[PDB]
Amino acid sequence: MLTDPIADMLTRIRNATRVYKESTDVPASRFKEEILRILAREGFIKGYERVDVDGKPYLRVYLKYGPRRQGPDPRPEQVIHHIRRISKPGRRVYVGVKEIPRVRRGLGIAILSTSKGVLTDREARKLGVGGELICEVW
Amino acid sequence: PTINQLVRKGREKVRKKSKVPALKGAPFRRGVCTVVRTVTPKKPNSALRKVAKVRLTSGYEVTAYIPGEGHNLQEHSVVLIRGGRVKDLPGVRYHIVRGVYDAAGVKDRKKSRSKYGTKKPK
Amino acid sequence: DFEEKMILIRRTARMQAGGRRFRFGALVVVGDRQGRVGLGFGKAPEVPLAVQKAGYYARRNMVEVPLQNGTIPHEIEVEFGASKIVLKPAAPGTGVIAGAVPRAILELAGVTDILTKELGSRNPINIAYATMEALRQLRTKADVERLRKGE
Amino acid sequence: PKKVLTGVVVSDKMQKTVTVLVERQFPHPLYGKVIKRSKKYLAHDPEEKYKLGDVVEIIESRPISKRKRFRVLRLVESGRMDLVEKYLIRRQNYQSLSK
Amino acid sequence: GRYIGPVCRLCRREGVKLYLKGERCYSPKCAMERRPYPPGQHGQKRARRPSDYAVRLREKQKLRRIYGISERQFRNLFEEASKKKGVTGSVFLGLLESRLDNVVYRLGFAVSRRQARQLVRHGHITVNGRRVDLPSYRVRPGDEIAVAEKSRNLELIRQNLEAMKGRKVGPWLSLDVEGMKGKFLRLPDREDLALPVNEQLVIEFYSR
RNA sequence: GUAAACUCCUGAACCCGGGACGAAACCCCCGAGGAGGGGACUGACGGUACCGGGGUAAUAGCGCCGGCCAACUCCGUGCCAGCAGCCGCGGUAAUACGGAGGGCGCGAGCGUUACCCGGAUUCACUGGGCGUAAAGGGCGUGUAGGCGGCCUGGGGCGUCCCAUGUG
RNA sequence: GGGAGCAAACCGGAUUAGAUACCCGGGUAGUCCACGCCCUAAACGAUGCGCGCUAGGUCUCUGGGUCUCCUGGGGGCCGAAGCU
Ligand SMILES: [Mg+2]
Ligand SMILES: [Mg+2]
Ligand SMILES: [Mg+2]
Ligand SMILES: [Mg+2]
Ligand SMILES: [Mg+2]
Ligand SMILES: [Mg+2]
Ligand SMILES: [Mg+2]
Ligand SMILES: [Mg+2]
Ligand SMILES: [Mg+2]
Ligand SMILES: [Mg+2]
Ligand SMILES: [Mg+2]
Ligand SMILES: [Mg+2]
Ligand SMILES: [Mg+2]
Ligand SMILES: [Mg+2]
Ligand SMILES: [Mg+2]
Ligand SMILES: [Mg+2]
Ligand SMILES: [Mg+2]
Ligand SMILES: [Mg+2]
Ligand SMILES: [Mg+2]
Ligand SMILES: [Mg+2]
Ligand SMILES: [Mg+2]
Ligand SMILES: [Mg+2]
Ligand SMILES: [Mg+2]
Ligand SMILES: [Mg+2]
Ligand SMILES: [Mg+2]
Ligand SMILES: [Mg+2]
Ligand SMILES: [Mg+2]
Ligand SMILES: [Mg+2]
Ligand SMILES: [Mg+2]
Ligand SMILES: [Mg+2]
Ligand SMILES: [Mg+2]
Ligand SMILES: [Mg+2]
Ligand SMILES: [Mg+2]
Ligand SMILES: [Mg+2]
Ligand SMILES: [Mg+2]
Ligand SMILES: [Mg+2]
Ligand SMILES: [Mg+2]
Ligand SMILES: [Mg+2]
Ligand SMILES: [Mg+2]
Ligand SMILES: [Mg+2]
Ligand SMILES: [Mg+2]
Ligand SMILES: [Mg+2]
Ligand SMILES: [Mg+2]
Ligand SMILES: [Mg+2]
Ligand SMILES: [Mg+2]
Ligand SMILES: [Mg+2]
Ligand SMILES: [Mg+2]
Ligand SMILES: [Mg+2]
Ligand SMILES: [Mg+2]
Ligand SMILES: [Mg+2]
Ligand SMILES: [Mg+2]
Ligand SMILES: [Mg+2]
Ligand SMILES: [Mg+2]
Ligand SMILES: [Mg+2]
Ligand SMILES: [Mg+2]
Ligand SMILES: [Mg+2]
Ligand SMILES: [Mg+2]
Ligand SMILES: [Mg+2]
Ligand SMILES: [Mg+2]
Ligand SMILES: [Mg+2]
Ligand SMILES: [Mg+2]
Ligand SMILES: [Mg+2]
Ligand SMILES: [Mg+2]
Ligand SMILES: [Mg+2]
Ligand SMILES: [Mg+2]
Ligand SMILES: [Mg+2]
Ligand SMILES: [Mg+2]
Ligand SMILES: [Mg+2]
Ligand SMILES: [Mg+2]
Ligand SMILES: [Mg+2]
Ligand SMILES: [Mg+2]
Ligand SMILES: [Mg+2]
Ligand SMILES: [Mg+2]
Ligand SMILES: [Mg+2]
Ligand SMILES: [Mg+2]
Ligand SMILES: [Mg+2]
Ligand SMILES: [Mg+2]
Ligand SMILES: [Mg+2]
Ligand SMILES: [Mg+2]
Ligand SMILES: [Mg+2]
Ligand SMILES: [Mg+2]
Ligand SMILES: [Mg+2]
Ligand SMILES: [Mg+2]
Ligand SMILES: [Mg+2]
Ligand SMILES: [Mg+2]
Ligand SMILES: [Mg+2]
Ligand SMILES: [Mg+2]
Ligand SMILES: [Mg+2]
Ligand SMILES: [Mg+2]
Ligand SMILES: [Mg+2]
Ligand SMILES: [Mg+2]
Ligand SMILES: [Mg+2]
Ligand SMILES: [Mg+2]
Ligand SMILES: [Mg+2]
Ligand SMILES: [Mg+2]
Ligand SMILES: [Mg+2]
Ligand SMILES: [Mg+2]
Ligand SMILES: [Mg+2]
Ligand SMILES: [Mg+2]
Ligand SMILES: [Mg+2]
Ligand SMILES: [Mg+2]
Ligand SMILES: [Mg+2]
Ligand SMILES: [Mg+2]
Ligand SMILES: [Mg+2]
Ligand SMILES: [Mg+2]
Ligand SMILES: [Mg+2]
Ligand SMILES: [Mg+2]
Ligand SMILES: [Mg+2]
Ligand SMILES: [Mg+2]
Ligand SMILES: [Mg+2]
Ligand SMILES: [Mg+2]
Ligand SMILES: [Mg+2]
Ligand SMILES: [Mg+2]
Ligand SMILES: [Mg+2]
Ligand SMILES: [Mg+2]
Ligand SMILES: [Mg+2]
Ligand SMILES: [Mg+2]
Ligand SMILES: [Zn+2]
């Protein structure tokens, strides 16, 4: 039935990266695109494209990964060490401009859905607006 | 427990109970001795300790310890109760305040005399 | 060469007909106070030999620390299975506020300004490992934009 | 000023009066989750023109009776028994609680 | 009421040389250099490993003994040093050297930080042409810390000030051996001060 | 333990002289009973604050010293007397009882009891859990409630920004 | 209402210091059926239900398809990552 597609997607990106997949898919959505756009446009994923799976609209997300490491377990670096949905359906999270988190002292990001559109944490403070704290990445 | 569960049932506020019902939440409680005695201590240790039942102005009747070597409490001695458990003596929740009322301080004691109502000597 | 210091020493045991033979444990940190830090744990039938072994094993497992002027680049909530620790940066003149363990580590790390808290198990040994793995995961805007570079 | 709110009529049995049920929502003080809550109001209807299942707008007004302190302002949309049923069913279940 | 009593025992405990007294502490002993070990029946016994608390404590008491100031006062400052924006560590030292009785010592008018207080209470001091006897006084920047009118001619004052000339003192201080005046140029500074105490240690101690 | 004595230096207390601010308006003439101007009265505190002169070295306690937790030795005592916030100490060799020496910590205060928050991340929103440690309902059906897929448009309740009022 | 076998309780034998038991010889309610109550359990995977996502190897039950195999639905084991 799916309760929340967004957290699913984030989870699909998360479980994908843990194994170092080249890319995975996820059902299409105007909204989901925006999250990927900002996600890739911030250097977390290579990009995406509206692929097709049995006439079913999906968005194939191309993953990014660090270089190989030295020593035991050359498990490469992650480009997304931490992805997590904030405002859940079980409890929506809305914020005023002031409240927006600093996320990992600037290093991190945090998508917000707002009446200006979807935009990262710094962007919100930039054009001075607040909205649903969708999630955050770093 | 899901947020919704929390919205409904909520969290259970702790509430603790007074380790010492000296009543009135008072720091001290006057009372009259009634059974000056001598009880054996708990399991690990051994040495007949000095205790006394007291009828308090708070209505209750409780046992309390007598600090220091030797004392001067008889059946009708008035005394001031301090409160402070004794791991050795099960059931004793209070302490006699030496040097107040019919309670006498320790005779000829140089160290920590304050904890026993003993003036400083010459 | 480096500043040597240990968190704890402990005597364990092991039953055996007629009695109980002992070993000693030694949790030791080593640091330059400029970035290099490491932690070792060695066991040996006597204390001194135990501290030495710990000192040795310690000098092995080293790690750099991206100190941004006495402080840390960014906070982190690393959980070492049972134990959990939280590092968090702070302005100068704050000092290192932490438990006996991370205190010993962060100090030899050349850190001087950072607030912390030991949530979960307080076990020294695991709290130690937790702090290490914690530092091992710190990053700077460099390494970061370096990964979001992929050039 | 002179507060005004919207709700469905859930009673018309009274003379020149109707009971209006108004919901309202707001984030939980400690848990955030937008939670619902509602309340019945006795409204003054000097013609019983408004009937069961009507969604309306009642306005803070001069005291008409012990409980009546709002006059019905205007009909929002007629016929919505579906909502009335929810409120009536909510009641029905109360029977299944006592002992 | 301040310390009073055997001070050189402090020299010995903190292990460091505490320059409280005048001549002596430069002679062949601040008490030290004859008994570098701590007081008491022991002291000269195999020293015991010190706890984090031992350290944060002593390094704190060492700074307090230095200014020979009360615990209540010392503390009310540290907290006041926190409210103020600016490195609380250095700032706290800042509020310390701004302390009047101390100004008098750093301006050389007195042989000791303690005889400095004495001179102060007895009123031998002035600040912008106004007598002051409260060692506590927070000396603002740009203040005529001069000797009292009456006080000028006096065995000690003359003697101390006499000995003082030539000896350039305090980067943030301006001694005028002429009229026996002096000025609090500005709040001191991190390196302008030198003291056997890592201030960060005191910060860590007052976290508890 | 520079601790004392001793040497020198300053001068709390005490004595003497001076001695307030707080008090300008009411009221009275000039003007007009207005605006303006001018004139005078009133101090409980108090001979107090404060200024000036003379001027004596001039109270120190209380807690603690086994680990937490800064601070160790001698003697007495022998599961006795007693200690104790928890862990625990005492049964001839006690830094834990009692005294002393010394030490540590605060200081006109020091300790004790009571109470509140903290630590307690141990009611966990921040920020906890439920295979074996406390914890999944014996299993279903279903009511209210809570929650809900992709696209287009209207409204703008939630949400968000601004100004303004209030705070 | 039914009652062959078995069998709490019960009686006897044995064992033992005792044996109100384990073993033996007997034996009733019950166990069986109808209708109606009772509603508990180590009612245990000691693991709530639904959905999506994250290596594979092998074993088996059952469907579909020209079929050293491919593709659904169950039942076990071994085990990536990961969790503990
Ligand atoms: Mg779409
Ligand atoms: Mg959250
Ligand atoms: Mg309740
Ligand atoms: Mg207690
Ligand atoms: Mg009394
Ligand atoms: Mg006393
Ligand atoms: Mg070991
Ligand atoms: Mg070796
Ligand atoms: Mg090795
Ligand atoms: Mg983990
Ligand atoms: Mg592990
Ligand atoms: Mg865990
Ligand atoms: Mg910490
Ligand atoms: Mg903690
Ligand atoms: Mg609102
Ligand atoms: Mg209601
Ligand atoms: Mg009425
Ligand atoms: Mg009426
Ligand atoms: Mg019923
Ligand atoms: Mg009920
Ligand atoms: Mg009933
Ligand atoms: Mg009833
Ligand atoms: Mg106080
Ligand atoms: Mg004068
Ligand atoms: Mg604090
Ligand atoms: Mg704190
Ligand atoms: Mg003499
Ligand atoms: Mg002289
Ligand atoms: Mg003389
Ligand atoms: Mg004079
Ligand atoms: Mg006087
Ligand atoms: Mg006079
Ligand atoms: Mg006069
Ligand atoms: Mg007036
Ligand atoms: Mg006038
Ligand atoms: Mg008047
Ligand atoms: Mg006239
Ligand atoms: Mg007139
Ligand atoms: Mg006038
Ligand atoms: Mg007068
Ligand atoms: Mg008078
Ligand atoms: Mg006079
Ligand atoms: Mg004299
Ligand atoms: Mg004297
Ligand atoms: Mg003298
Ligand atoms: Mg004492
Ligand atoms: Mg104490
Ligand atoms: Mg000790
Ligand atoms: Mg102790
Ligand atoms: Mg201690
Ligand atoms: Mg204590
Ligand atoms: Mg005896
Ligand atoms: Mg003896
Ligand atoms: Mg002995
Ligand atoms: Mg012994
Ligand atoms: Mg002793
Ligand atoms: Mg002593
Ligand atoms: Mg105090
Ligand atoms: Mg007190
Ligand atoms: Mg209360
Ligand atoms: Mg509490
Ligand atoms: Mg705790
Ligand atoms: Mg606790
Ligand atoms: Mg609890
Ligand atoms: Mg806890
Ligand atoms: Mg809560
Ligand atoms: Mg827990
Ligand atoms: Mg269980
Ligand atoms: Mg179950
Ligand atoms: Mg159960
Ligand atoms: Mg059960
Ligand atoms: Mg049941
Ligand atoms: Mg039904
Ligand atoms: Mg039902
Ligand atoms: Mg529903
Ligand atoms: Mg939706
Ligand atoms: Mg809905
Ligand atoms: Mg479309
Ligand atoms: Mg849409
Ligand atoms: Mg359309
Ligand atoms: Mg819409
Ligand atoms: Mg709106
Ligand atoms: Mg605007
Ligand atoms: Mg605003
Ligand atoms: Mg406003
Ligand atoms: Mg305003
Ligand atoms: Mg405003
Ligand atoms: Mg205001
Ligand atoms: Mg038959
Ligand atoms: Mg029959
Ligand atoms: Mg039968
Ligand atoms: Mg049979
Ligand atoms: Mg029979
Ligand atoms: Mg027979
Ligand atoms: Mg039998
Ligand atoms: Mg037998
Ligand atoms: Mg028998
Ligand atoms: Mg029988
Ligand atoms: Mg039968
Ligand atoms: Mg029966
Ligand atoms: Mg059958
Ligand atoms: Mg039949
Ligand atoms: Mg039949
Ligand atoms: Mg029945
Ligand atoms: Mg049954
Ligand atoms: Mg049950
Ligand atoms: Mg089973
Ligand atoms: Mg399950
Ligand atoms: Mg399931
Ligand atoms: Mg395969
Ligand atoms: Mg096989
Ligand atoms: Mg088949
Ligand atoms: Mg085919
Ligand atoms: Mg099955
Ligand atoms: Mg089966
Ligand atoms: Mg299988
Ligand atoms: Mg594994
Ligand atoms: Zn000296």
Side-chain angles (χ1 to χ4, degrees), chain E residues 5-82:
Chain E
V7 305
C8 262
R9 73 187 332 280
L10 316 174
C11 294
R12 294 168 59 186
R13 167 60 75 180
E14 255 71 345
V16 180
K17 208 165 194 177
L18 295 178
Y19 290 138
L20 11 71
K21 294 170 158 293
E23 160 202 320
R24 298 217 77 189
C25 293
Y26 289 90
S27 96
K29 83 300 295 181
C30 184
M32 297 278 288
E33 287 162 322
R34 300 177 60 81
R35 289 229 203 94
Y37 46 48
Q41 172 187 358
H42 317 289
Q44 42 186 172
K45 298 192 171 184
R46 166 55 182 172
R48 185 66 283 107
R49 299 309 309 175
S51 80
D52 293 339
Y53 185 64
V55 193
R56 275 75 187 168
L57 192 175
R58 302 270 56 154
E59 195 74 308
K60 159 270 173 184
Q61 290 237 225
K62 189 187 305 176
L63 188 57
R64 202 183 101 249
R65 260 78 181 266
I66 276 182
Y67 296 92
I69 200 184
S70 71
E71 253 294 18
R72 186 70 191 176
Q73 266 166 316
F74 192 80
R75 189 69 178 280
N76 284 102
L77 308 178
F78 186 94
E79 308 300 341
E80 173 173 348
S82 303

Side-chain angles (χ1 to χ4, degrees), chain C residues 2-3 29-39 58-59 61-67 105-111 132 135:
Chain C
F2 314 86
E3 181 76 274
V29 179
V30 161
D32 66 337
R33 296 188 174 271
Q34 299 284 325
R36 304 299 191 186
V37 259
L39 193 166
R59 298 182 182 271
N61 179 26
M62 301 294 304
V63 60
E64 48 78 14
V65 170
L67 300 104
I105 285 72
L106 301 188
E107 184 173 322
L108 305 188
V111 183
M132 296 304 294
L135 298 177

